[PDB]
Write a new protein. Structure first.
Ligand SMILES: NC(=O)c1ccc[n+]([C@@H]2O[C@H](COP(=O)([O-])OP(=O)(O)OC[C@H]3O[C@@H](n4cnc5c(N)ncnc54)[C@H](OP(=O)(O)O)[C@@H]3O)[C@@H](O)[C@H]2O)c1
Ligand SMILES: NC(=O)c1ccc[n+]([C@@H]2O[C@H](COP(=O)([O-])OP(=O)(O)OC[C@H]3O[C@@H](n4cnc5c(N)ncnc54)[C@H](OP(=O)(O)O)[C@@H]3O)[C@@H](O)[C@H]2O)c1
Ligand SMILES: NC(=O)c1ccc[n+]([C@@H]2O[C@H](COP(=O)([O-])OP(=O)(O)OC[C@H]3O[C@@H](n4cnc5c(N)ncnc54)[C@H](OP(=O)(O)O)[C@@H]3O)[C@@H](O)[C@H]2O)c1
Ligand SMILES: NC(=O)c1ccc[n+]([C@@H]2O[C@H](COP(=O)([O-])OP(=O)(O)OC[C@H]3O[C@@H](n4cnc5c(N)ncnc54)[C@H](OP(=O)(O)O)[C@@H]3O)[C@@H](O)[C@H]2O)c1
Lengths: 251, 251, 251, 251
């Protein structure tokens, strides 16, 4: 079990990619603390994963709120004695249309949850990882960071920013033995992406436009994340891995 | 005169790269409106460029203020009858240290001026460009967007975000015949960059680390911006050009 | 005349992009030597350009032949006293199909003319540029280097190799004050690309698939090349500029 | 065992990164056929891995020879019934100096072993993978493809070409359900890379120069390759993963 005795936080982990990641980390031996905004979602997720015999607890954490971030870390520290792994997976996107039409308020919300919360969550775990001799951070971006989704401009820009955040954190935290990498999913079937593939007609347009044979599933993302969070990836930092089924990204 | 009869706004154009850009656009035939936060800097710059026989006026514009952005555009419309070119050059960096220590307030200032103000300035000019049958927008990022400068993390992240912003704007404004490109300077001698190349020992270390033969000067950036803002670049959009004297960037 | 008194070689310059580049360099003040494989194509091109008042002469040069390369440089040296600029534009593509079916002989032809000939042509001009205090090399690649064209695999791979060649030459020739940059055209209307945009149905499919408003013309490439070959671009080396009308390339 | 019952070929697998990959694939359940040019090296490697209880056989295969490539595939088919995985790891570099001084003979050798042999090896395995319903190909490039090593220009160019080859093969083989990915190692301690980390002066220098805390070991590359060759990576194709310990690569 590659993550035996490790303690992982996964934000936004009560559905979709975050849940698949949390499940896999726990299957690979970690103690996982799951979280999201709504208590009912946390409760259901914890119950499901505990029912699979996994070492999982959970609490509400809206990543945009400082007190919630601090309480999430405190929970891991108090139940398990520290934190080894952070998977930062939360995102918001309250906008669709031409980028130039997005309001200042839309930009503030997207930049706060998608970019600032990521770095502030990382700041919250770093001192705990230092106590453990190091750790791993994985940030969830998007292939739209490289090749933008039509009509998702502000979101896409926040995801490009995360590419840069990954690189800067990896350089700046290397002296602390903390690795920082990034997952850039393609079109993965989830509630957050659902509108893009709800109609069979829109789904088939997406597949032709993205040049993919199938849509991804949340579990298509879980293996690479578990691997990157493991000591077997000790010479991998500052790296983005695209999980996009062949859709274009970068050289 | 490749920009004869064109009207250009250059933000943050009372020193450094923005001044060199404003000078060159005007030498190339444009009517240029220069601006920055301080009236004395605007006055000095306008006097200098007028004294060189260039068609230049100026006003105060703090790009982070909606009223200032609107008034800048209105000034160009009222004097010259429209706007053809926007060069968005303003940036702030209130931070020098390890990225993990930057507070929410530091992130808010950097993201507001460096990212949000860029898009909101673009939104302010687009309707005027549409009336003219098209236009050119040039956003100033940094080679740090690709290869981060040490101690400059939050700033570097904002500059990466601008690579994304350029791409999204280029796609979305193409139907309106508005091109959007980006200049990514390397180590250029300006007041803003002084900490990096100040002392002889730090300068020699920067040249060896960056693998450059000389530091750049502001005028080294001006020609490409003028070219990109011209109709001779009509099939060039969505592009970032690095002006870095051979320092590393990307394939 | 930004290239007044400069001497330029443009390979493969009797049609298409090469011809547009040669015309523009000469319009901007350079003495240009054009060349290609067939004397008839050379004669037609020299007649046209001399008819426009331009300082152009020509010779046969198949870039894959060492003797031809040597004689081309010697011609420029004899006519004009040296060489300042090399634009390397030749390419071959004897293949249209799935990459897995191309034989060793197809690869040998493509790699020889598209890659080896480029570096060997550069080697031939370097000593002449040294005598002049420096010079400029521009290599013509393709947006297919980043996002491969369908059925053009072996060619696309050669074009990616040229990105690497540009970077390596720019680093290794900087001490000689020789800059090396690359032009990566998108879908430009030429004889070479005819099968891709020929019938109206395939043209509309290419414009949608590439996300462009129009196809490019050879002259759309000429301005950036002239600029990069000028002393106004003295702080630009190791850079690829895509001329693709907003088709996808890279951050 | 993520690769249980799978059959893998790893070229150039009797030392260094190739050996670590072969070892790990076999530890993860695969039947592996190792190979390289010299029978003594093959024998030694097979003996070592068999001694560890791994399902390994070997044969001589100079990847530049068609008959050797054909016979390697045939061996796996005759012993195991098919081929699921190809790891293409062979490389040559008979040159050290300025790229411009590399002769045609040098270029021919590098392009033949490093680029052509890779695609020809892939062609040899594709029909066998089709009989199995799909498969995985992993090409070994280098971080030098993005940021060239000094004095290794022709080699670096060949590695950049492999980034393009990976992308083109991934697109063109997707209809056959064959995934194609690439490993780009950084500074890994091996015989091949010895010149970059000779004595204590050049080792501590290149750590500061490349911005890494340690040199890599061949096993640092093995986990990602095994992962990418597994069905857990079924939504990952056309991807390059850098294993570079924080050395610069790309966004
Ligand atoms: N789906 C795709 O095609 C795809 C593609 C590219 C990128 N992504 C990225 O993948 C990540 C996960 O998205 P997903 O598609 O897997 O979403 P999903 O299935 O819709 O799940 C969203 C999860 O986020 C939680 N959440 C939302 N806002 C939160 C906040 N402020 N703080 C904490 N938790 C929050 C939700 O629970 P609560 O409602 O209880 O808060 C839920 O657990 C995001 O970074 C997204 O940008 C997804
Ligand atoms: N120098 C480098 O090595 C380097 C490298 C990469 C990128 N860049 C980029 O180049 C651009 C220009 O920087 P520089 O180095 O040329 O700077 P500089 O010489 O120090 O000049 C800064 C200019 O910006 C104005 N300014 C500052 N904040 C402003 C605001 N909020 N609104 C409007 N104007 C403002 C200043 O005038 P006031 O004080 O009157 O406002 C002044 O005209 C920036 O985007 C920077 O990030 C520079
Ligand atoms: N057209 C596009 O959409 C496009 C897109 C991406 C890249 N490009 C690149 O642009 C460059 C120019 O191509 P083009 O489309 O402009 O072609 P074009 O209009 O067909 O012109 C081809 C030119 O190359 C010459 N030529 C061919 N083989 C040669 C050789 N071995 N040695 C010397 N000259 C040779 C031809 O003259 P002779 O017959 O007399 O030899 C002719 O002058 C190439 O590098 C190409 O890969 C074009
Ligand atoms: N080490 C690094 O820092 C590093 C960095 C970037 C990339 N790489 C890449 O990693 C890969 C592995 O290199 P390495 O450093 O691990 O090498 P290594 O430890 O020196 O081993 C070289 C292996 O290749 C075999 N070989 C050489 N030429 C061959 C040929 N023509 N056909 C078949 N086998 C051949 C050798 O055995 P025989 O003598 O018996 O043929 C030996 O097994 C290469 O693609 C290399 O470019 C390594």
């Amino acid at each position: 079990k590659p993550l035996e005795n490790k303690v992982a936080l996964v934000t936004a982990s009560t559905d979709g990619i975050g849940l698949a990641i949390a499940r896999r980390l726990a299957q690979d031996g970690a103690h996982v603390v799951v979280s999201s905004r709504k208590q009912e979602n946390v409760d259901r997720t914890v119950a499901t994963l505990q029912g699979e015999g996994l070492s999982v607890t959970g609490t509400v954490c809206h990543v945009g709120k400082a007190e919630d971030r601090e309480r999430l870390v405190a929970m891991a520290v108090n139940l398990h004695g520290g934190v080894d792994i952070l998977v930062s997976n939360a995102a918001v996107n309250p906008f669709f249309g031409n980028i130039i039409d997005a309001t200042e308020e839309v930009w503030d919300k997207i930049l706060h949850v998608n970019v600032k919360a990521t770095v502030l969550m990382t700041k919250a775990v770093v001192p705990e990882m230092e106590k453990r001799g190091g750790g791993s951070v994985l940030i969830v971006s998007s292939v739209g960071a490289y090749h933008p989704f039509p009509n998702l401009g502000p979101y896409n820009v926040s995801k490009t920013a995360l590419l840069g955040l990954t690189k800067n954190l990896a350089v700046e935290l290397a002296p602390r033995n903390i690795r920082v990498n990034c997952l850039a999913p393609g079109l993965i079937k989830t509630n957050f992406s659902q509108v893009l593939w709800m109609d069979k007609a829109r789904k088939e347009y997406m597949k032709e436009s993205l040049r993919i044979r199938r849509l991804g599933n949340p579990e298509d993302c879980a293996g690479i994340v578990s691997f990157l969070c493991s000591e077997d990836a000790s010479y991998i930092t500052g790296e983005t891995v695209v999980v996009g089924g062949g859709t274009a990204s970068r050289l």
